[PDB]
UniProtKB/Swiss-Prot annotation:
The modification Phosphothreonine is found at T397. It is an enzyme of class 1 (oxidoreductase). NAD(+) 2 binds at W72, E369, N446. The keyword Transit peptide applies. The chain holds residues 125 to 611 of 613 of the full protein. Monomer (oxidized form). Homodimer (reduced form). Upon reduction with NADH, undergoes dimerization and forms tight, long-lived FADH2-NAD charge transfer complexes (CTC) resistant to oxidation. Also dimerizes with isoform 3 preventing its release from mitochondria. Interacts with XIAP/BIRC4. Interacts (via N-terminus) with EIF3G (via C-terminus). Interacts with PRELID1. Interacts with CHCHD4; the interaction increases in presence of NADH. Keywords: Acetylation, Apoptosis, Charcot-Marie-Tooth disease, Cytoplasm, Deafness, Disease variant, DNA-binding, Dwarfism, FAD, Flavoprotein, Intellectual disability, Isopeptide bond, Membrane, Mitochondrion, Mitochondrion inner membrane, NAD, Neurodegeneration, Neuropathy, Nucleus, Oxidoreductase, Phosphoprotein, Primary mitochondrial disease, Transit peptide, Ubl conjugation. This is Apoptosis-inducing factor 1, mitochondrial. The modification Phosphoserine is found at S144, S168, S247, S400, S406. Changing Q111H: In SEMDHL; severe decrease of protein expression. Changing G214E: In COXPD6; with early-onset severe motor neuron involvement; decreased protein levels; decreased oxidoreductase activity on cytochrome C; slowered reduction with NADH; strongly decreased NADH oxidase activity; strongly decreased NADH oxidase activity; no effect on DNA-binding. Under normal conditions, a 54-residue N-terminal segment is first proteolytically removed during or just after translocation into the mitochondrial intermembrane space (IMS) by the mitochondrial processing peptidase (MPP) to form the inner-membrane-anchored mature form (AIFmit). During apoptosis, it is further proteolytically processed at amino-acid position 101 leading to the generation of the mature form, which is confined to the mitochondrial IMS in a soluble form (AIFsol). Ubiquitination by XIAP/BIRC4 does not lead to proteasomal degradation. Ubiquitination at Lys-131 by XIAP/BIRC4 blocks its ability to bind DNA and induce chromatin degradation, thereby inhibiting its ability to induce cell death. It catalyses: A + NADH + H(+) = AH2 + NAD(+). It is linked to Combined oxidative phosphorylation deficiency 6: A mitochondrial disease resulting in a neurodegenerative disorder characterized by psychomotor delay, hypotonia, areflexia, muscle weakness and wasting. Some patients manifest prenatal ventriculomegaly and severe postnatal encephalomyopathy. Charcot-Marie-Tooth disease, X-linked recessive, 4, with or without cerebellar ataxia: A neuromuscular disorder characterized by progressive sensorimotor axonal neuropathy, distal sensory impairment, difficulty walking due to peripheral neuropathy and/or cerebellar ataxia, and deafness due to auditory neuropathy. Additional features include cognitive impairment, cerebellar atrophy, dysarthria, abnormal extraocular movements, tremor, dysmetria and spasticity. The age at onset ranges from infancy to young adulthood. The gene is AIFM1.
């Protein structure tokens, strides 16, 4: 029943967010389409954001089993994109009436033969295709100190990516006295807050350490990076900025992290959250171009790597309408680019002109959104205000019904943006020559279309305090 077919019209390599969106797209445009997703994981397609967020905010002990979570508004949602009975079997796929979408789980595509329109799986199965999407996502970066420390340290280090890592780390959280997160980024900070909340109830320790001066310091300016660090500290987490890891070893049963400044940190387990590299292993056999500067498969405006091979999601190095070649790690991009790839695979020939958004929540009470070029080394103007009662992720989730912020923001850009005639929220403009090239929104929701319009228009702005009024910052 899960026997690989010899041929499929639409082959999707990888079974994450972009592949699911593509399958949906293909099927909407061609209701008899036969679509095979090949997924190296055991699980059917699922979304990632809850893995560092709402799944940790449950008191139900069978969360690890069901992977149902409660949104910030109390409403239950499955991590899976659709119920498992909505897929057809791989065996049935070639000739079942009206086609369908099948998933081969626990199978990895290891070779791509582009001239022959064929892939080979790790078990030796050969599948030919008519149209192919590469949607392989990324592979977490390791830390060189872990790489050089050997197998014992490696075995006590988690690179947090999938359902399996949620399960392993949630178990570690219940069982050990101290966990250290290495990395200042959004994922590391979400995990710090999640683990920190668990630890408060157990009386245990969570450390977050990183070389930057504060959380998300590569992206946020000092004021908001510092504020974030304080929020994380308010959760009980021990945050160690300006920490440069020299080495990691085991000392009488504990991990011992040595920092350049002379500090030594003893802990039971390490989570490394220091980014990823696109999964481009198939470029070798496929002879496909990869981007040496940004990583990822190079694609054209229509997301094509070849006449009949598209790329979407984290794996794609696309041409951003404003910024040129880039890759992102955004749920929004994976949805929109996967949907577009599917449309183009069914004859749309439409260009990828979407401006991808990003969001992060540090619990129900603090959220961020970002769009465009967001880099703390650029000149910035931050405009802040006291928060109102609605300016938090929980309220945004209550109003919209969803915690997936890309859905509630919409994909749209505003049609017009006429300026109308402690701090807890604000807007940060990232600049080039008075032109806004990126925006971070701090506890401001339902305004992403305005931010997109500002950046798309690319006008010079004489007074960004006036522009901030569009974000209800006065
Ligand atoms: C824990 C976590 C939290 C996140 N939170 C947010 C958030 O709040 N907001 C946001 O904007 N973004 C968030 N992201 C980013 C977002 O989830 C990703 O951008 C999105 O998952 C990318 O989708 P994708 O389809 O490109 O890749 P993935 O969803 O990673 O799917 C790729 C799949 O392909 C499989 N695969 C790879 N190679 C092969 C092969 N050769 N054969 C078969 N299978 C293969 C992989 O195992 C994987 O299952 C988060 C990511 C993670 C990990």
């Amino acid at each position: 029943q899960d026997k690989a077919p010899s041929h499929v019209p639409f082959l999707l390599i990888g079974g994450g967010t972009a592949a699911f969106a593509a399958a949906r797209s293909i099927r909407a445009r061609d209701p008899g389409a036969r679509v095979l997703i090949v997924s190296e994981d055991p699980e059917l397609p699922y979304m990632r954001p809850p893995l560092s967020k709402e799944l940790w905010f449950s008191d139900d002990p069978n969360v690890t089993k069901t992977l149902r979570f409660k949104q910030w508004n109390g409403k239950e949602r499955s991590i899976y994109f659709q119920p498992p009975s909505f897929y057809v079997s791989a065996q049935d796929l070639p000739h079942i009436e009206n086609g369908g979408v099948a998933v081969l789980t626990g199978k990895k595509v290891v070779q791509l033969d582009v001239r022959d329109n064929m892939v080979k799986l790790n078990d030796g199965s050969q599948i030919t295709y008519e149209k192919c999407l590469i949607a392989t996502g990324g592979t977490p970066r390791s830390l060189s100190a872990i790489d050089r420390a050997g197998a014992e340290v490696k075995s006590r280090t988690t690179l947090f990516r999938k359902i399996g890592d949620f399960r392993s780390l949630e178990k570690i959280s219940r069982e050990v006295k101290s966990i250290t997160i290495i990395g200042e980024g959004f994922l590391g900070s979400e995990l710090a807050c999640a683990l920190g909340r668990k630890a408060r109830a157990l009386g245990t320790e969570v450390i977050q350490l990183f070389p930057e001066k504060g959380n998300m310091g590569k992206i946020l300016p000092e004021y908001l990076s510092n504020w974030t660090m304080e929020k994380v500290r308010r959760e009980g987490v021990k945050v160690m900025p300006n920490a440069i890891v020299q080495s990691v070893g085991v000392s009488s049963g504990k991990l011992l992290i040595k920092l350049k400044d002379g500090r030594k940190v003893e802990t039971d387990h390490i989570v490394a959250a220091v980014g990823l590299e696109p999964n481009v292993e198939l470029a070798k056999t496929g002879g496909l171009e990869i981007d040496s500067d940004f990583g990822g498969f190079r694609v054209n405006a229509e997301l094509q790597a070849r006449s009949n091979i598209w790329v979407a999601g984290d794996a794609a190095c696309f041409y951003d309408i404003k910024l040129g070649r880039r890759r992102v790690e955004h749920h929004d991009h994976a949805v929109v680019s996967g949907r577009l790839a599917g449309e183009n695979m069914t004859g749309a020939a439409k260009p990828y002109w979407h401006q991808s958004m990003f969001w992060s929540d540090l619990g129900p009470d603090v959220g961020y959104e970002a769009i465009g070029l967001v880099d703390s080394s650029l000149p910035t103007v931050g405009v802040f205000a006291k928060a109102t009662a609605q300016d938090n992720p929980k309220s945004a989730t209550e109003q919209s019904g969803t915690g997936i912020r890309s859905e509630s923001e919409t994909e749209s850009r505003a049609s017009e943006i006429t300026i109308p005639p402690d701090y807890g929220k604000g807007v940060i403009f990232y600049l080039r020559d008075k032109v806004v090239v990126g925006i971070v929104l701090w506890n401001i929701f339902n305004r992403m279309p305005i931010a997109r319009k500002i950046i798309k228009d690319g006008e010079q702005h004489e007074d960004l305090n006036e522009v901030a009024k569009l974000f209800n910052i006065h």
